[PDB]
């Protein structure tokens, strides 16, 4: 496989004769494809948090949980989601959607969740007071494809509802593997804190899993069909 070019097929999967293995490789035979020296190891770390979100009561759609991509509400007019705490802003943008954290001193004082269709009006490190707009939700707003809502708690107050969402998702981290290193973990395996992913000649260059997550192998040096 050419440099920086990823595989179209996955490790361990059956192959048919003539079936392309990659944009520049056609397998002459049928069998099991195997990864030869994955140069990039992507780890999807599992994160389970609890975040909040205030919405107009009319726009909201009542559900006990929310699947990815599923509509969370529909606004007739632009709505301003406001801070209910004072503090400094830690803006953590995902692929789509974001987690906005408010903290005073070291301690986090608030954690809001911005679904898709909700443009954040603050930058990282910004100081906010209560009632200050943190994000503008325009039109329809939905769950991002990468995050799912396990449980939903709703608190009716005035003409608004406050949602405590028990969210679960994954965050990717890439690791560039060097030729003198060897991956000691298979595809789709679950790792914890302290577990080694890629070994090396010297201990300081090893790849140890920070938190809990799953392992994905990309960009193999070559592919061995057997």
């Amino acid at each position: 496989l050419p440099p920086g070019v990823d595989a179209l097929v996955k490790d361990g999967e059956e192959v048919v004769k003539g079936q392309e293995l990659a944009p520049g490789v056609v397998s002459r035979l049928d069998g099991v494809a195997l990864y030869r020296f994955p140069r990039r190891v992507r780890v999807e770390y599992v994160k389970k948090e609890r975040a909040g979100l205030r919405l107009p009561l009319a726009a909201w759609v009542e559900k006990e949980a929310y699947k990815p991509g599923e509509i969370l509400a529909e606004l007739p007019e632009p709505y301003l989601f406001r801070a209910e705490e004072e503090g400094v802003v830690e803006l953590k943008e995902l692929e789509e959607g974001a987690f906005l954290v408010l903290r005073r001193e070291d301690e986090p004082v608030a954690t809001y969740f911005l679904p898709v269709g909700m443009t954040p009006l603050v930058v990282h490190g910004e100081i906010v007071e209560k009632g200050q707009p943190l994000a503008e939700a325009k039109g329809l707003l939905r769950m991002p494809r990468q995050v799912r809502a396990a449980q939903v708690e709703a608190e009716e107050e005035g003409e608004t509802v406050y949602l405590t969402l028990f969210l679960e998702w994954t965050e990717p981290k890439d690791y560039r593997v060097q030729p003198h290193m060897n991956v000691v973990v298979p595809e789709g395996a679950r790792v914890e804190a302290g577990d080694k992913i890629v070994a090396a000649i010297d201990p300081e260059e090893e790849v140890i899993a920070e938190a809990e997550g799953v392992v994905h192998l990309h960009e193999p040096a070559s592919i061995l069909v057997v």
């Binding site: 030869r36 020296f37 030729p179 003198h180 060897n182 040096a221 070559s222």
Partner: protein, 111 residues
């Protein structure tokens, strides 16, 4: 075919760890590292090549290698692991030599 840097390093690593594994198996079993090495090598190569090794105190025949292989296979999982390590070690050894047969020619043509 000629090895890439990665393939080369991989094979060398497998060989080294394989030898270390034979050492560990000698520690556990209380057997002779040489005998164990010869049994592993015998299984990797096959029934075609089973001859008596000069240093071995015991004549290496399929019977004895089967007895020793059964003494090895009868180990706990974490102990039986080193056996697999050793086997893959020998395999890597064969492949490493065979991959590096050209260099020998390129040198020998000058003598």
């Amino acid at each position: 075919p000629l090895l890439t840097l990665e393939e080369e390093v991989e094979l060398a690593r497998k060989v080294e760890e394989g030898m270390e594994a034979i050492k560990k198996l000698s520690e556990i079993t209380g057997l002779d590292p040489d005998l164990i090495r010869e049994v592993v090598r015998a299984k990797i190569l096959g029934s075609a090549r089973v001859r008596h090794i000069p240093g071995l105190k015991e004549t290496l025949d399929p019977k004895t290698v089967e007895e020793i292989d059964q003494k090895l296979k009868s180990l706990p999982k974490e102990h039986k692991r080193y056996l697999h390590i050793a086997r893959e070690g020998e395999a890597a050894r064969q492949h490493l030599i065979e991959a590096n047969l050209r260099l020998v020619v390129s040198i020998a043509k000058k003598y």
